[PDB]
Amino acid sequence: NYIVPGEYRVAEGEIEINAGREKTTIRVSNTGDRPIQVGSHIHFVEVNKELLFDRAEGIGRRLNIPSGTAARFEPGEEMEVELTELGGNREVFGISDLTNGSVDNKELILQRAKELGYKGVE
Amino acid sequence: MHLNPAEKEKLQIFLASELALKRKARGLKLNYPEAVAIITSFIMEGARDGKTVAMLMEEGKHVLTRDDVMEGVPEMIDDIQAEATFPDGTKLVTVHNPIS
Amino acid sequence: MHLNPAEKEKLQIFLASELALKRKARGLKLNYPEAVAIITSFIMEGARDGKTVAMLMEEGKHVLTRDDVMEGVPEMIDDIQAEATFPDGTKLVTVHNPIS
Amino acid sequence: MHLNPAEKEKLQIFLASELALKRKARGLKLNYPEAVAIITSFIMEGARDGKTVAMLMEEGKHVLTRDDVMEGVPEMIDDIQAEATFPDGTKLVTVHNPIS
Amino acid sequence: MKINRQQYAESYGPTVGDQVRLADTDLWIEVEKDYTTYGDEANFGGGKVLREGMGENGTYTRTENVLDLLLTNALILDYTGIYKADIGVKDGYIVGIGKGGNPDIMDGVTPNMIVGTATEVIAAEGKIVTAGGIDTHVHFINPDQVDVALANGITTLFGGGTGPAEGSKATTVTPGPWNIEKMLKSTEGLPINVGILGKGHGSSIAPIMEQIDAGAAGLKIHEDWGATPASIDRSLTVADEADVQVAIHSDTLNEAGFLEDTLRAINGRVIHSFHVEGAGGGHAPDIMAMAGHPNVLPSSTNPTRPFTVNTIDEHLDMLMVCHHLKQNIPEDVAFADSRIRPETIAAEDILHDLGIISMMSTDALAMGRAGEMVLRTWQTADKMKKQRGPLAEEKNGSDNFRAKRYVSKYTINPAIAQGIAHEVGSIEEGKFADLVLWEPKFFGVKADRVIKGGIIAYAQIGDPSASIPTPQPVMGRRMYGTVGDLIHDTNITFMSKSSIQQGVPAKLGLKRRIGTVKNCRNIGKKDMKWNDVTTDIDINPETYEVKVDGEVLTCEPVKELPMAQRYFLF
Amino acid sequence: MKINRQQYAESYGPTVGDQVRLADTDLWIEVEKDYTTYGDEANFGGGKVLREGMGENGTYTRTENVLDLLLTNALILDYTGIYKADIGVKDGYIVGIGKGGNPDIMDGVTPNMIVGTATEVIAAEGKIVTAGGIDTHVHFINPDQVDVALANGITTLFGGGTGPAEGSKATTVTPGPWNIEKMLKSTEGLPINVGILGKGHGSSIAPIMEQIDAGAAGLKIHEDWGATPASIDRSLTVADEADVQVAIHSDTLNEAGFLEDTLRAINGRVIHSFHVEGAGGGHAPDIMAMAGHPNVLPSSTNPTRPFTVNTIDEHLDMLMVCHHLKQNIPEDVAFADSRIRPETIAAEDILHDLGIISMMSTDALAMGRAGEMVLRTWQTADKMKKQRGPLAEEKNGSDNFRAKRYVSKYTINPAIAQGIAHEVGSIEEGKFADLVLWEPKFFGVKADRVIKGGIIAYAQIGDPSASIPTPQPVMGRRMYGTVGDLIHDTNITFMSKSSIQQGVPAKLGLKRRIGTVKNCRNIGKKDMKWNDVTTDIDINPETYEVKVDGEVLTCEPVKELPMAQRYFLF
Ligand code: NI
Ligand code: NI
Ligand code: NI
Ligand code: NI
Ligand SMILES: [O-]
Ligand SMILES: [O-]
């Protein structure tokens, strides 16, 4: 009974994030010479052009990592990441201007990605 | 003297540290603001002495120990921050978990 | 430190008491604000020590005597009041005719 | 205590002088505001002691010497001015070139 | 992926079933429910969720369901519950409690809680968020009292006075139309919500009513102005016409009547009984029996809260010095002994715990501490848990029942009593955004940030010359909500319906938000949240023993409190 | 009669060819020219020249070429020159720089610089007079930051924030119409010139533009809100329509692009690149390459200025604590190591000296010191003189070239970048009378007197109870320009053309002088005074080595600075 002012007594268990959403694992490579760090909630197909991965598998998705965290890719680093599905209305506006609407417009997103030189449009 | 606003404010820290050191000298376990004042004044006097930021980051962890303060005070102080004029200008010192 | 307004203000009392005690140490008869500062700081340090309100009501009458202060100062001070944090929270101490 | 605005302000000078005297005691060469604080507090404590304006004009030139302060500080201080309550009321003391 | 509960609480604040200690007390609050969607928590910073096209919507203009301010991940402690939610503010009001962010990509977003271009963010993860405290017994004696109140999470001051005049030093009274007008104009510069009480004294209605028409928000009946049957009656007739509350400090001296005479003058009408224990004033020795009646809204002032070993010595001496009483005059000693009673002060602790006293208040600078209403509420709850145990109604080992009973005493209950709960007093949608953020280690001691009308007014913050705001010295400071003309938009002057209808704000040039006092006359004890108990309180005239349901209410004074010497420099 | 040059300089301040040391630095400024007529110098006091029928004209009314204020015998240090002149002020503006006095009896009197009945006098003999500093990277976090800025000679704050909200603690952003309106009203009480930046984030124009219409003076793009190609593009489209500046803190994380992607989104449009070295934020590790481009107006923030032995230890620790980074998480350490680079901080000193970085700024309370923009400018110039020598362009052994290059960085250049150089940023006829007087021994350290709109706002002055103003304690104090309604006439709120046209000042009841932002979109690097250099900056992605014209830019950190422990009590 030593008192730590304002201490927590957390309940038992674990918190499952993004429960009930499809997960997908993909390989991603930083082909650039500078580090790239990607946050939990960026539409994954719209990340830095020099990240090489199957861009189609990024559409309608983001990293399956705790809210507010980020995945780091050192220059030349290739690693696997796990993606989860976007929720809400499944619409993306802005960011890299690849979507500007429904994430269901896969053909249009990849055409824009290919024209602007986002690596990995297959 | 040409005191600026920060110089006026920081005299209070010195004063609170003197108050706290008098309380420690008559045998009291120090409370949260007393402990913070003592460690903060130590940092600003160290800068005045010409110590480095790295020296004060080290020394600031050994100014007060658990048995100098009341129960729970070590766990209330996660870090103490102070800015002072070093020989190379104002710098920020952060002392992490100063009372272990 | 998280100082509130009263904590900032009451540092002044401690400071004035230190000033007054230095003046008494070099042999001066103390004046009205000096005497008030010394007795007030004694009360707030006593509370910090964990004395009772009743102990400080008694002790506060024996901090300064007539021959410590200038002519008329005893008769100018009818009572000195201070609030401080005791172990059981803030309490008001009144010292009646502290210099007899 | 019935402090007026000037009494509140001038406690700062005493406090800065105490800070500066602690720095001098651990062997530091004093800077511009430290030096000014020490000489100013000396003047106001001298008035409190009942010295004359003429005595303090003389004594104030011998409180700190060149080897107590950093390079250039003597030449930065052309004169130090203080008002304090003498036995015959408030008077202005000016100390000319206090550090020669 | 799964996150362990310790790491989850460190990142986002606690979630369902987690407990948090209140400061250095023995009291634990448990998260009852959580509005979040796990994985879509809102947070702000580099690479965090609230960024354009992500958790921040980049499409919608401010009018289109976008917030001015999102407090993320708050642990709300309120009469309505102890729960985890985001809090959305717009136009200075709470507009949403739920889940904020971007419906483009997030599940579970409350539809009017969009984070957009227009949205500011306050991180409340790991903070406790409460309503601003409502202090209904304020003497306006020294303007320095406002920062004192803000530093302990008080956001509304109801009371009276003109500064350090003897009338004001004794009584929460701003007397007459001219003093009321002058203090409404003074209020334009005070960075807190204010309501002014007029003098509840007179034998003709017109002298009393003209104070309500001038802009008073209520009345105070005080024995120092003559708490006579006539003054009580005329004040409650005015109050019933004007729809404002009446507070009473009754006739301690029993000069024109005993408690039963004051109750007959009240005649079943609604009244707020101040310092109902009676050390602060009232019929000796039995005033606390008021707290049993259905038409009485009973408050304590703070100097008796809670009962400690220094309480009686401190109060007896304070009463003697303030009343110029002589230790060698037997009538003076008899009066003091009749007014400062360990028997009623000890019972007052238990009456709070039982929900029989509904409200706390300060009595700021008259016989109470402007900055200790919240502090002493929690010290009382902690003492009662130690001496009486967990209340029977508790579950999961939490103190949630006690925490809701006690937070009500200084938030919603004073607001209901005063007729201002439509504006303030709780964290509910549609109320003014007066919010206090607390670090749990400082809970009830020193507020972290005080939000007034959706802008920070007061904060514990460091060196303004530093590279960052946390370096020492960290102290309470007024923030931008108090500066310039923003003081007018972040604060409310509460006024009578008649003064508002008669255009007093325009006549005086008041620029503050104007709050209407209403619905004060058809409430009672049953309307006090978590504190609605009516009962026959017996006070023995010989022993001063308090009995409820045939049982003596007594407890011991304590030698130490939490929220005391660990925290304060003096 | 002839006067020896030492006695002349002691009486009237220095004249042509005389040199003055700046504080305790190695830097010397030389008087280039002098507007006086020797023997007819203006001065004020008993038996002095500015007396009725003598150097004061007794005939002319105020409208007839008479000044409201004459600063006598000023040593001006300005991008326009280092020279000796009288400065004449009227209606709060600088109306004459030349020779003041009475054309009745004096030769060489500038015709609109008559000292008359209406004229106040400030003696500037032996003072250095500069324009007020223009700080374009201010976080509005703690209102105590304003006096801090005034004490170091800053007179204009451009930035954003709502007080100590997390959005404001990270970003110079006042988001959306309501927060902007609230902070314009707060500004009515701040005794300094202000311009507010909105959130430069969104994928639709309307949410961004509605901030400009509400009274924002510019936008801030910050990575913490998503410094994406879309937010960059929409902000610069708004800026080009509205004629306001855009400041950027780019994507440090390189999440949606590298520096070349941000430059492609900018697409040749004008932008102010904040903390361009990148410790304060931006594409790791090569953001400083922005400073080579013709459409970029590049600023430094102050914590890296100049490179010292404690800089890296201080910054690495500050970044880790402020971002909640763990010393045992390799991604956290990698991020910190990628952002705090001795290679780019050392090169930043030299890029300032070469005129490749055009501006200084604080980053007040986010990662920079509100009161050290002017201080650290001169410490940088002094370090560069020691390490690189006098610049090739110097003559007479003076540091005049360097002094004009460096004074431009915190006066005229920020004003040009922001679109406010028609009002502020230099000592020129027709500009607002924001003037700072410095004793040379305190130059760049502690301002003597700060004049705002022709009235003293802030001064180092002594005991207010004394017979005279010089007795101790001498400290920075707000003067009469800050008191009452005079705060409205001595300060400017800078606002967009659209907000002014739409009557936002009248809607909000703003009483301050309203300044129009304009001419921000058809400037570039070539418009930065003394700091107009464009070049290919290469930053090696492996070693972080900076090269310009094939040469590595590197220098050593210093163990000591001037303008430091000689002056400061802490
Ligand atoms: Ni009362
Ligand atoms: Ni009262
Ligand atoms: Ni930045
Ligand atoms: Ni910044
Ligand atoms: O009272
Ligand atoms: O920044």
The string of DSSP codes covering F174-185 is --HHHHHHHHHH
Tell me the backbone φ, ψ of residue F195, rounded to 5 degrees. -130, 135
**Do residue A92 and residue E53 have CB atoms under 8 angstroms apart?**
yes
- Cβ within 8 Å of A, E 34-63: 37-43, 45, 47-49, 51-55, 57-59
Residues of F forming the annotated binding site for Ni(2+)? 137, 139, 220, 249, 275, 363
Largest Cα span, chain D = 42
Contact of A6 with chain E, judged by CB distance below 8 Å, is answered with yes
Tell me the backbone φ, ψ of residue B82, rounded to 5 degrees. -150, 145
Residues E72, E100 contacting (CB under 8 angstroms): yes
Mutation target among F252, F254, F341 for the A interface, most CBs of A within 10 A: F254
Residues E289, E547 contacting (CB under 8 angstroms): no
What residues have CB less than 8 Å from F211, skipping those under 6 apart? Answer: E117, E118, F175, F176, F177, F180, F198, F199, F219
- Distance (Å, whole) CA E470 – CA E449: 13
Pull the structure tokens for residue F111: 């015709």
Cβ neighbour number for residue E340 with a 10 Å cutoff = 23
**Pairing mode, strands A36-39 and E19-21:** unpaired
Cα dihedral value B55, B56, B58, B60, nearest 10 = 160
Residues F278, F352 contacting (CB under 8 angstroms): no
Residue from E7, E119, E126, E132 nearest E52 by CA: E119
- Distance (Å, whole) CA F256 – CA A82: 19
CA-nearest residue to D19 within chain F is: F569
Peptide bond into F306 cis (omega under 30): yes
Residue F249, ligand 6, Cβ within 6 A: yes
**Chain A contacts of B72, Cβ < 8 Å?**
2-5
Residue where one domain finishes, among candidates E460, E483, E506:
E483
Residue F114 burial (10 A CB sphere; 0-12, 13-18, 19+): buried
Residues of F forming the annotated binding site? 137, 139, 170, 220, 222, 249, 275, 363, 366
* E459: amino acid identity, one letter: A
Residue where one domain finishes, among candidates E464, E483, E502:
E483
Helical H segments across E411-535, by residue range: 412-418, 486-489, 497-501, 504-508
- Distance (Å, whole) CA F355 – CA F233: 28
Helical H segments across E198-258, by residue range: 205-214, 229-242
Residue from B70, A34, A92, E50 nearest F286 by CA: A34
Q: Are residues E102 and E136 in the same domain?
A: no
Q: Which domain holds residue A28?
A: 1-122
Q: How far apart are the first and last CA of chain F?
A: 49
Residues E349, E551 contacting (CB under 8 angstroms): no
Tell me the backbone φ, ψ of residue F68, rounded to 5 degrees. -80, -30
Helix (H, G, I), strand (E, B) or coil at B8: helix
Region class of F364: left (phi > 0), else alpha (psi between -120 and 50), else beta: beta
Residue E387 burial (10 A CB sphere; 0-12, 13-18, 19+): middle
**Pairing mode, strands A23-30 and A78-85:** antiparallel
Residue F280 Cα distances to E11, F8, F137, F275, F414, angstroms? 24, 47, 11, 5, 18
Instruction: Please tell me the distance between residue F254's alpha carbon and the centre of ligand 5 in angstroms.
Output: 64
Q: Which long-range contacts (CB under 8 A, 24 or more apart) does F25-28 make?
A: F25/F378, F25/F379, F25/F381, F25/F382, F25/F562, F25/F563, F26/F382, F26/F385, F26/F386, F26/F562, F27/F378, F27/F381, F27/F382, F27/F385, F27/F399, F27/F402, F27/F403, F28/F397, F28/F398, F28/F399
What residues have CB less than 8 Å from D8, skipping those under 6 apart? Answer: C12
Q: Are residues E191 and E295 in the same domain?
A: yes
Residues F132, F440 contacting (CB under 8 angstroms): no
- Distance (Å, whole) CA F302 – CA F444: 14
Mutation target among E54, E121, E565 for the A interface, most CBs of A within 10 A: E54
**Do residue B85 and residue F563 have CB atoms under 8 angstroms apart?**
no
Domain of E302, CATH number, reads 3.20.20.140
Q: Are residues E504 and E356 in the same domain?
A: yes
Residue F50, ligand 6, Cβ within 6 A: no
What residues have CB less than 8 Å from D32, skipping those under 6 apart? Answer: B1, B2, D70, D73, D76, D77, F566, F567
Helical H segments across F354-508, by residue range: 373-388, 400-410, 412-418, 486-489, 497-501, 504-508
Cross-chain CB nearest to C48 (options B13, B16, B28): B28
User: CB contacts < 8 Å between D and F, how many?
Assistant: 60
**Pairing mode, strands A101-102 and A91-92:** antiparallel
User: CB contacts < 8 Å between E and F, how many?
Assistant: 204
Contact of A10 with chain B, judged by CB distance below 8 Å, is answered with no
Helix (H, G, I), strand (E, B) or coil at F66: strand
Overall residue count recorded for chain C in this entry: 100
- Distance (Å, whole) CA D34 – CA D21: 8
Domains assigned to chain D: 2-100 (3.30.280.10)
- Distance (Å, whole) CA F304 – CA F326: 23
- Distance (Å, whole) CA F243 – CA F497: 8
Chains B and C make contact, 3+ CB pairs within 8 Å: yes
Q: How far does Cα A55 stand from its chain's mean position?
A: 11
- Distance (Å, whole) CA E453 – CA E437: 14
**Distance from F24 to chain D by nearest Cα, in Å?**
8
Q: Are residues E388 and E465 in the same domain?
A: no
Cβ neighbour number for residue F469 with a 10 Å cutoff = 12
Helix (H, G, I), strand (E, B) or coil at E184: helix
Residue from F294, F274, F264 nearest F197 by CA: F274
Q: How far does Cα F198 stand from its chain's mean position?
A: 20
Cβ neighbour number for residue C71 with a 10 Å cutoff = 8
B75: enclosing H helix or E strand? helix B73-76
What residues have CB less than 8 Å from E179, skipping those under 6 apart? Answer: E162
CA-nearest residue to C80 within chain E is: E321
Helix (H, G, I), strand (E, B) or coil at D52: coil
- Distance (Å, whole) CA F365 – CA E479: 14
Cβ neighbour number for residue B98 with a 10 Å cutoff = 25
Pull the structure tokens for residue E529: 């949240």
Q: How many structural domains is chain F composed of?
A: 2
Residue F368, ligand 6, Cβ within 6 A: no
Bridge-partner residues for F447, per DSSP?
none
Residues E279, E531 contacting (CB under 8 angstroms): no
Helix (H, G, I), strand (E, B) or coil at F410: helix
Instruction: Please tell me the distance between residue C58's alpha carbon and the centre of ligand 1 in angstroms.
Output: 29
Cross-chain CB nearest to D15 (options C15, C22, C36): C15
**Do residue F566 and residue D73 have CB atoms under 8 angstroms apart?**
yes
Residue E278, ligand 5, Cβ within 6 A: no
Locus of tokens 């008494």: C24
Neighbours of ion ligand 4 (CB under 5 A): F 363, 366
Bridge-partner residues for B21, per DSSP?
none
Q: Are residues E118 and E140 in the same domain?
A: no
Helix (H, G, I), strand (E, B) or coil at F139: strand
Residue from F272, F291, F275 nearest F195 by CA: F272
Per-residue DSSP letter, E502: T
Q: How many structural domains is chain A composed of?
A: 1
- Distance (Å, whole) CA E171 – CA E201: 12
- Distance (Å, whole) CA D66 – CA F239: 59
* F169: amino acid identity, one letter: K
Q: Are residues E365 and E440 in the same domain?
A: no
Domain of E4, CATH number, reads 2.30.40.10
Region class of F205: left (phi > 0), else alpha (psi between -120 and 50), else beta: alpha
- Distance (Å, whole) CA A20 – CA E35: 18
Residues F215, F187 contacting (CB under 8 angstroms): no
Q: Resolution in A, one decimal?
A: 1.6
Q: Which domain holds residue F511?
A: 132-425+484-570
Pull the structure tokens for residue F337: 């190591």
**Pairing mode, strands D79-86 and D89-96:** antiparallel
Cβ neighbour number for residue B73 with a 10 Å cutoff = 22
- Write down the experimental method used for this entry: X-ray
Residue from E72, E109, E67 nearest E89 by CA: E67
Per-residue DSSP letter, E349: H
Q: How far does Cα E229 stand from its chain's mean position?
A: 30
- Distance (Å, whole) CA E138 – CA E204: 27
What residues have CB less than 8 Å from F254, skipping those under 6 apart? Answer: A32, A34, A35, A36, A37, A48, F283, F284
Q: At CB < 8 Å, which residues of chain D contact B?
A: 12-13, 15-16, 18-19, 22-23, 26, 28, 32-33, 36-37, 40
3-state secondary structure F448-484: CEEEECCEEEEEEECCCCCCCCCCCCCEEEECHHHCC
**Distance from A19 to chain F by nearest Cα, in Å?**
26
**Do residue D33 and residue F567 have CB atoms under 8 angstroms apart?**
yes
Residue F552 burial (10 A CB sphere; 0-12, 13-18, 19+): middle
- Distance (Å, whole) CA E159 – CA F143: 29
Half-sphere exposure (CA, 13 Å, Cβ side) for A94? Answer: 35
Q: How far does Cα F215 stand from its chain's mean position?
A: 22
Burial B12-34 (b: 16+ CB within 10 A, else e): bbbbbbbbbeebbeeebbbbbbb
- Distance (Å, whole) CA A45 – CA A53: 9
CA-nearest residue to A97 within chain F is: F230
Residue E461, ligand 5, Cβ within 6 A: no
- Distance (Å, whole) CA E568 – CA B26: 18
**Do residue C33 and residue D8 have CB atoms under 8 angstroms apart?**
no
- Distance (Å, whole) CA F187 – CA F183: 6
Q: Are residues E125 and E136 in the same domain?
A: no
Q: Are residues F143 and F169 in the same domain?
A: yes
Locus of tokens 């005079």: F486
Pull the structure tokens for residue A1: 């009974």
Q: Are residues F19 and F51 in the same domain?
A: yes
**Do residue B31 and residue E473 have CB atoms under 8 angstroms apart?**
no
- Distance (Å, whole) CA F336 – CA F359: 25
Mutation target among B3, B23, B32 for the E interface, most CBs of E within 10 A: B32
Q: Are residues E197 and E175 in the same domain?
A: yes
**Do residue C1 and residue B15 have CB atoms under 8 angstroms apart?**
no
Residues F114, F98 contacting (CB under 8 angstroms): no
Bridge-partner residues for F19, per DSSP?
F30
DSSP string spanning F187-198? Answer: HTT-SSEEEEEE
Instruction: Please tell me the distance between residue E69's alpha carbon and the centre of ligand 6 in angstroms.
Output: 21
Q: Are residues F351 and F490 in the same domain?
A: yes
Residues E289, E296 contacting (CB under 8 angstroms): no
Torsion over CA: F282, F283, F284, F285 (sign)? negative
Helix (H, G, I), strand (E, B) or coil at F267: coil
**Chain A contacts of E21, Cβ < 8 Å?**
3-9
Domain of A70, CATH number, reads 2.10.150.10
- Distance (Å, whole) CA D3 – CA F457: 27
Mutation target among C90, C95, C96, C97 for the E interface, most CBs of E within 10 A: C90
- Distance (Å, whole) CA E359 – CA E349: 12
**Distance from D73 to chain F by nearest Cα, in Å?**
8
Q: How far apart are the first and last CA of chain B?
A: 39
Half-sphere exposure (CA, 13 Å, Cβ side) for C81? Answer: 9
- Distance (Å, whole) CA F547 – CA F544: 10
Residue E434 Cα distances to E129, E130, E151, E423, E491, angstroms? 10, 9, 14, 10, 9
Residue F146 Cα distances to E332, E405, E460, F191, F476, angstroms? 55, 43, 18, 7, 12
Q: How far does Cα E455 stand from its chain's mean position?
A: 19
Tell me the backbone φ, ψ of residue C8, rounded to 5 degrees. -60, -50
Locus of tokens 């329509």: F241
Pull the structure tokens for residue A43: 């539409």
E strand residue ranges, D20-68: none
Residue E249, ligand 5, Cβ within 6 A: yes
Residue from F345, F167, F337, F335 nearest F253 by CA: F335
Instruction: Please tell me the distance between residue E223's alpha carbon and the centre of ligand 1 in angstroms.
Output: 8
Residues E355, E132 contacting (CB under 8 angstroms): no
Peptide bond into D87 cis (omega under 30): no
Q: Are residues E421 and E373 in the same domain?
A: yes
What residues have CB less than 8 Å from E463, skipping those under 6 apart? Answer: B6, B9, B10, B83, E469, E471, E472, E473
Residues D85, D72 contacting (CB under 8 angstroms): no
Residues of E forming the annotated binding site? 137, 139, 170, 220, 222, 249, 275, 363, 366
Bridge-partner residues for C35, per DSSP?
none
Residue F537 Cα distances to F183, F289, F353, F560, angstroms? 39, 5, 15, 29
Helix, strand, coil shares, percent, chain C, to 5 = 55, 20, 25
Cross-chain CB nearest to C11 (options B12, B26, B28): B12
**Do residue F230 and residue A50 have CB atoms under 8 angstroms apart?**
no
**Chain C contacts of D48, Cβ < 8 Å?**
23, 28
- Cβ within 8 Å of E, B 54-73: 70, 72-73
**Distance from B1 to chain D by nearest Cα, in Å?**
4
- Distance (Å, whole) CA E173 – CA E182: 13
Residue E280, ligand 5, Cβ within 6 A: yes
**Chain D contacts of C36, Cβ < 8 Å?**
1
- Distance (Å, whole) CA E295 – CA F138: 55
Cβ neighbour number for residue D38 with a 10 Å cutoff = 25
Per-residue DSSP letter, F132: P
**Active site (annotated) includes residue F323:** yes
Residues of E forming the annotated binding site for substrate? 139, 170, 222, 249, 366
- Distance (Å, whole) CA F2 – CA F14: 16
**Pairing mode, strands E69-78 and E120-123:** parallel
DSSP string spanning E87-121? Answer: EEEETTEEEEEE--B-TTT-SS--TT-B--TT-EE
Helical H segments across E323-430, by residue range: 330-339, 342-353, 373-388, 400-410, 412-418
